[PDB]
Structure formats: structure tokens, C-alpha cells
Amino acid sequence: IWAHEALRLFQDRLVEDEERRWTDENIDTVALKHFPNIDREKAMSRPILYSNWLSKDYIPVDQEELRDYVKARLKVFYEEELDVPLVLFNEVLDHVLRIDRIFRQPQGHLLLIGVSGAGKTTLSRFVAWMNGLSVYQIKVHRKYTGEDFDEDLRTVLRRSGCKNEKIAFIMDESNVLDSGFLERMNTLLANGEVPGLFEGDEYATLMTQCKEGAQKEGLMLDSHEELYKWFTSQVIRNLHVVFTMNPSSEGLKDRAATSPALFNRCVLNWFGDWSTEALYQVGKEFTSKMDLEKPNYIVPDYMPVVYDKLPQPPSHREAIVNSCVFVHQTLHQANARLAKRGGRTMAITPRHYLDFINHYANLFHEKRSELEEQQMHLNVGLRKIKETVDQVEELRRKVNRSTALLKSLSAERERWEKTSETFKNQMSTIAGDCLLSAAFIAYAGYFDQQMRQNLFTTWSHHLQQANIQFRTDIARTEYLSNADERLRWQASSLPADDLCTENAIMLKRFNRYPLIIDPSGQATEFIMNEYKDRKITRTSFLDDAFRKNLESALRFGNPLLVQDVESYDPVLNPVLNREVRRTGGRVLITLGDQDIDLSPSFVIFLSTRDPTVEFPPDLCSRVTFVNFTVTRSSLQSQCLNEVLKAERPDVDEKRSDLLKLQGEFQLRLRQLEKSLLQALNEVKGRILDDDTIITTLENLKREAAEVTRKVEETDIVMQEVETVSQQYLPLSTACSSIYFTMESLKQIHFLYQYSLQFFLDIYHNVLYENPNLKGVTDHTQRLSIITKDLFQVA
Ligand SMILES: Nc1ncnc2c1ncn2[C@@H]1O[C@H](COP(=O)(O)OP(=O)(O)O)[C@@H](O)[C@H]1O
Structure with a gap:
């Protein structure tokens, strides 16, 4: 018991792990120094836990028994008030025990300092429900004022003191909009009452209520002073205040002076971020369903160490989960390197790790399912072809049709065998491929292409050193997307470059409702065009009708596009976190005070036109960043297309239609x-069924005709077009260099802020509004004039 209390009072507040280790060592050292004959293992066993849930007394418990009890209680909790599944690991058990300990005292006030999305609020809600404490959380909005806060304080105090109901009052660093909020908290936490909160008639009614409460407890109180004293005692008894903060320096010392009652009346629990341990246990537990079994796995000699307690035989599953925690960890080094050289780094909350693991699981299941169907179709096709070949050979011992079909079916068999051999390697490397894919989907949405590539390279190097099989020399934008949806996106006016394709990939496979950073309107229109069928609605936070449209989009299941997110309304905080209640056979979600029946089809997209905006980490944990930056190659391609449209319009029009037709030929070839x-797999006729042989030879004729036509157009027409375009490419290179110099200009001077549209106007003016070009018809002189005038006008 002595050691348990020493740990709860000397190590909860510690920040670094070194300090925690020092405390744990010195507990044992002191106990051994004073007690020289005690048995260490019966008193100093490492998982010191104490709980009174299982029994009627505050006895020690065991991790496994407590885990089972907590699992059962969580199962009841989901059906009771919050259908958000959790993962249980050692830290969650310790933290729920600590929070219950504080909740049991009369004036039990808590201060949970830890990264956003780490589960602080939901753990507190869980344990408060366990102990029967009604949960109260103020609903902050755009016009939330100090008077609104005082109204909520009056209600919570009236329910605590009068009517004698236990309350857990959950607050966040975001809820304290003004300093008056912190002053009221200071007095409430230090004295159990706010003098001057109740004034005028309110006070009288309060006194009336207080009198009633005493009549409930049988106390005979009549003076307005003793009634107030009794009310204060009741509030000290039935009210617990919980505070959550982010572990930011210069914010704790600020609060140590702004409201010191947070450091003397509140128990400080330093959650921090999930430790390497916690990441390892959540990784293994969630990926348990996935088939990560590789019997022929080879362990490398110099394996890298991330989780210290990695089993000395690392199985495939352990290696995968170790790589998962490595992927999560590398984002922190990336953010540190980015902040050291420049800045604009976001926060890597544990909700990022949840998304990464969920993406890994879903993607593994999906790609495993597709490979099996394709391989089964290929095998049955090969079997049917072998059957018909043997049948024809027997019949030879009428036949012209057989040779005609065999003419193409021979190469068909050859490439079928080739594909069967290749895709069996894909089955071997499915784990590494899906790991890298989900990691990229979850952790590179905000970064630019150089950073995305560096992250992918580091993850690939780690997978290589850990002897994990991932299919290299491939590009992710093909593994994650088919040509059909790529065509559908491009028909939706999506720009044609890798970054935009993978941005749309993120916008399709999203767990947390995305936040789009588009300095232009391209992503906004792209979303509108795609969800135009589903009747997507355009709304803004600045719009006063935002709430009306939000409610309509939630109760009817229609997608919603919101701009100007710098003015984020905390009304969306539940919706983003998906705090749903599956009660009465229906899903219910709470906005402010009103509860509404959510529809499963509801989708919300948030967006902003400012790429140099910093978001608070509470929002940074609830959304999926999709950053639509501009790349060198995309700018070069757009500039080359523009100069070809202007200088040689006939070639551009030719190139445009030719490229449009080339796309349709590949589409039709895939369809055939x-x-x-x-047709091969569905029918039961090898050679006897004419009704099936008339629909297959014509298919080969169409295939041969279309391949001939495409090899004709893509080689003859595209050659001359390419030769025409290869002379304008120095212009496109020198045209992108100046734009990126302009973008870099903001570094030396804050006033030098230039947009892409500005340089595009420069370039359009140089092309279509150039007086020096009036009269010149030779294309070489025109190009020289264009490049000189571009430099000068820029
Ligand atoms: N240990 C965990 N296991 C599973 N999900 C978690 C865990 N911790 C947090 N979450 C997720 O975080 C979301 C709410 O986080 P919250 O507790 O509000 O963050 P904070 O602790 O910053 O308040 C929930 O939707 C939940 O899915």
C-alpha cells in the first residue's frame, strides 16, 4: 500500500520517462533500506494496482482480472451511452484506476494533461458513468459568452448543491474562451462556491431550492447564511471538475499564474502521448484479426529496435507491428526536422495511429479478397482452355474455327501464365504493400511531395532492414486506384498529376472527415462534381444558416461541403468524433443540447483557401488533412499545354483529341x-456450343482491330506531336522556376505574398497580350520573344 500511494503521489505528475524510472527505482531502494528482511516479490512486484470494483474493499487486483472486468463494463457502456469502441492496454488500466481514485474523494478535481485524441475525455466519461456521476460539458459555439458560461455554472451548481446529484464537470483548454471563465473556475475549485454568481431574484430562488434540499435531508435550516453554508458543503460533496490540456510548455506556467487553483486543488495526471509500449499493444491487438502469419519468415541479423520488449524470436506479426510503431514514430522526427528548417508542422495524435491501423486492416482485407477472385477466375479460365485444347486434339485424330481461336488463345495462355506467376508474388508481398499504402494514406496527407517521398523512402528502408516483403519498383497511385475511378475523377475536372490522384484517393478512403487545403478552388469544385448526384450542399461557418443546413444534412443523409474552416464551430466536435448512441434501434447524435437521429449516408468535408494557417490540435486530431499543393511537374505540364495552345493551336487541338481517344481505347480493351x-468462366461449352463460340471469336477480332488502331495512333501521331512539344519544354522549365522563386520570396519579407493566380496572370499576359509579338509569324522568333517577355514581365 505504501508503494502504491508513493507511486500515485510522486510519479503521476512526472513528465519524462527517465524521471518515472528514477522514482520506480528509488521506491524500492528506500523500502529495502528501511526494511531489510521484507520479501520484495510479495510487496514490490511491478504491476502495483489497487481497486475496489471487483469486491467491497480497496484491495489489490490483477491486470488480467481487471482487464476482463473493464471489458465487460465497456460492453455495457457502449449500449448505455457511447458506441465508440476502445482498445485496452496497460496504460488505460492504470489511468482508469487513477481517475476513479480521484473521483471517490468529496472535492475531487482532476487535471489530465496529455495529447489530444489520447482518450482523456472518453476515459473520464467512462469512469464517471461507472461511479454514477452525471457528466456535464459546456457547449461552446461562435457566440458563446461569459454570461452563457455563468448560466451553465449556475445550472451545474444548482444540480450539485440542491437536489444532491453527483456531477463530473468536464472542461477543456478550448472551453475557457476568456479570462473570466478561468476566474470563476479558480474560485469554484478553491472554495466550492462562487460568491456573487447568484444575484437578485436568482439568489432568492436558490435559497428556496436550498431550503427544499434540507427538507429532503431532514435538516432544519432557516437563515439565509446557514442555507448558503449547507449549499456550499453539498457542492463540495457532489461536484467533480475534470480538466484536459495539451502538454505544451509556456502554457502550464501561464496557467500556474492565471488560475493557481489548478495546481493546489486539482490532482495532476500527466498522460502525455501513447508510449512505444502503448503503440505496440494497440497495434498487435487491432491487427490480430488480420492474417499476418508467415511460416517461412527469415529474421535478419541486425534488426532495428523500436519496442524494447520485442520477443527475441520476432514472428511475422511482431515484425509487422514493430514496423507500424516505427511508422508512427517517424512522423515526429519529420515534424522536428521540418520545424527546425522552416516550420508549419502539425500534431501527430494517437487518432492518427488508429486511422493508420484501421486503414491497414481494411486495405489488407480488400486487396486479399480481390487477388483471390482474380486468381480463381484465371485458374478456371486456364482449366477451360486446357479442356478445349485436349478436346480439339482428340477430335483431330469443324476444326478451322478451333485453329482461328487458338491463334489468339496461345498468347492468351502465355500471358495468363505470366500473370499467374506475377500475382503469386503479390500474395507474398501483400503485407508490406498494404502497410506502406495505409501509412502513406494516414500520415502524408498534409505534406508536400518532397516530404511524402522522404517518408515513403524511410518506411521502405525500414521494411527492407526488417526483411518484410513489399513489392518495390511500383507506384502507389496505381496500387490504390483502378483506371475506371481515375477516369471518373478526371471527368470531374481533377488535375492530372500524381499528387491530385492520391489526394482523391485520400478523399475516398477516409475515416476522419477530411479537411481540404486548396489555395485555389479546384478541390472544392472536384468534390462538388463528384457528390453532385448525392445532392451535396455548399455551406460556410460564417453563414448564420450553417446550423440549419448542418441539422438537415445530418437527419437526411446528404453530403455537406463547408469552407472558411479557420472559423471552426465546436458544434461539430461530436460529429467529427462520431459520438453516436445506438439506442431504440437508431443512431442518435447530440448537437449542443438537441439530439437528432443521424443517417448513415451523412458525409462532411471541411476546406480553406489559406495554406499558411495553423490549426489548434483539438481540430488537428479530428480531421484528415488533404493538402492540394502545386508541384514542379504539374506546373511544367500546365505551362506546356498553355504554350502549345497559344503558339501552335492546331497541334494542341490534335493532341487533345488524340489523348482523349487513347484513353477510350484502353478502357474498351479492358472491357473486352x-x-x-x-464468358470463358460462365459458359459450359468448350467447342460444341456455337452460341458461345460466336461471341468469342468476334471478341478477338475487336481486340486485334483496336490494338492495331491504338498502336497506329499512339506511335505515328504522338511522335510528331512530341517533337513539336519538345522545343517548348525549356520555356516550361524556366516558367516553373520563376514561380517557385516567387513562392520562396515570402521567406525574406513577410509582405512578399504571391499566389499562383498572380503568376498565371503574368504568363497569360505574356502569351495573349504581348505587343512585341505583333507581326512575327516564325515560331522560333515568337518563342524567343515569349521567353524574354516572360522574364521581363515577371
Ligand atoms: N485507447 C483508445 N482506443 C480506441 N480509441 C481511442 C482511444 N483513445 C482515444 N480514442 C478515440 O478518440 C476519440 C475521442 O478522443 P478524446 O478522448 O475526446 O480525446 P482527448 O483525450 O484529447 O479528449 C474517440 O472517438 C476514440 O475512438
């Missing part, structure tokens, strides 16, 4: 391929 395979 699918129809061929489906």
Missing part, C-alpha cells in the same frame, strides 16, 4: 478483356 474472361 473482362467480357472474354467472364
